[PDB]
Symmetry: D2
């Protein structure tokens, strides 16, 4: 399993749980096509995602629905959503982890890439 996501809440100092996360593979027409989606688990993680064989070289975009996460705590968010576009390249494609640490007006993001 090469693609995991994690969401933290820097307001509660907990995992963000039930964050809708939608992945998109860029299509030839340089058009964003749905690839996989799921809801963050108990611990703020999502390993659903993909198959080693299905995750091929390309432009991928992880889109996190944060506004929703914020609204639901009855906090007013600045962002519409968080998104991260990266290239699944590297040597040949490996194991990614896309962490997002959130706040109403600020979010961070990181990739932890390991072989």
């Amino acid at each position: 399993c090469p693609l995991m996501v994690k969401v933290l809440d820097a307001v509660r100092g907990s995992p963000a749980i039930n964050v809708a996360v939608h992945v998109f593979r860029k299509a030839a027409d340089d058009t964003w096509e749905p690839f996989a989606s799921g809801k963050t688990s108990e611990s703020g993680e999502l390993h659903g995602l993909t198959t080693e064989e299905q995750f091929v070289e390309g432009i991928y975009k992880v889109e996190i629905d944060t506004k929703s996460y914020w609204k639901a705590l009855g906090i007013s968010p600045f962002h519409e959503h968080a998104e991260v576009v990266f290239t699944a390249n590297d040597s040949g494609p490996r194991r990614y982890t896309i962490a997002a640490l959130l706040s109403p007006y600020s979010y961070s993001t990181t990739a932890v890439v390991t072989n």
Copy 2:
């Protein structure tokens, strides 16, 4: 302030990120992204002169920062293609938006500082 300014910094190096291409869009009635403005950052890491209190109506705006180019430009292959900020501007009237991004090759952070013209 101008209704919109961007501040880009380098966490690798300890300085403003100079000459970073930045691109602002607005969602069209259409659900399509319309070119609103563009600039490159200056010597202080800043980008002003973007829009006007007037031209800057309510809507969903998207700031795209060409992070990729900047890192490459300096010899490093960063993780990310860009950095995008998606937000709703002027729904409760005109505000002053200050979007800052702190960059590392595999990490970036963005904050918003919103304020009242008055």
Copy 3:
């Protein structure tokens, strides 16, 4: 710029962190922390007027930001006691240091922007 300024922002709320107690120390010959300067942040989130190009010799300086007080002051019990920045200043000659901290109750980030007087 002054040789040292601090910029504190609120990520919860989308603004400068106003009236945040900040405390600067210097390690004494002694290995003991000596009171160098102190201020509270202003309306813009800033703190200037701290030292002087002259009073600000080489050394290890520690900036302590009273994060705890600020959050409590606004009804939230934050995780952290303070925020401390430990660094070596003016070893390759006088520089201009800009320390910023972006705060959340369970998270804080700090960046340094260093520059040449000339």
Copy 4:
């Protein structure tokens, strides 16, 4: 095991491995006393640390030796080290995770606290 640390490198998009991490319990005299220390593992984690029974209510300080981590990649750091002081209070003391994401001039930090 109530206390874990994790260190990421936002320059390499990897875990920071072999980061000296030293914990300190505040003593009555409001003096910092050694409590536990260890080196970050393969994955940037450190679970050595403490025993549920030994980790009591109090002021704790995790001190990360980052300058060393940076020097060793032959990169010049701004910080002397990263430190985090917190109170092991809560309801009654629970499970902490102190993550630190680092860069030469910037570092972030977070607690993920769960029951």
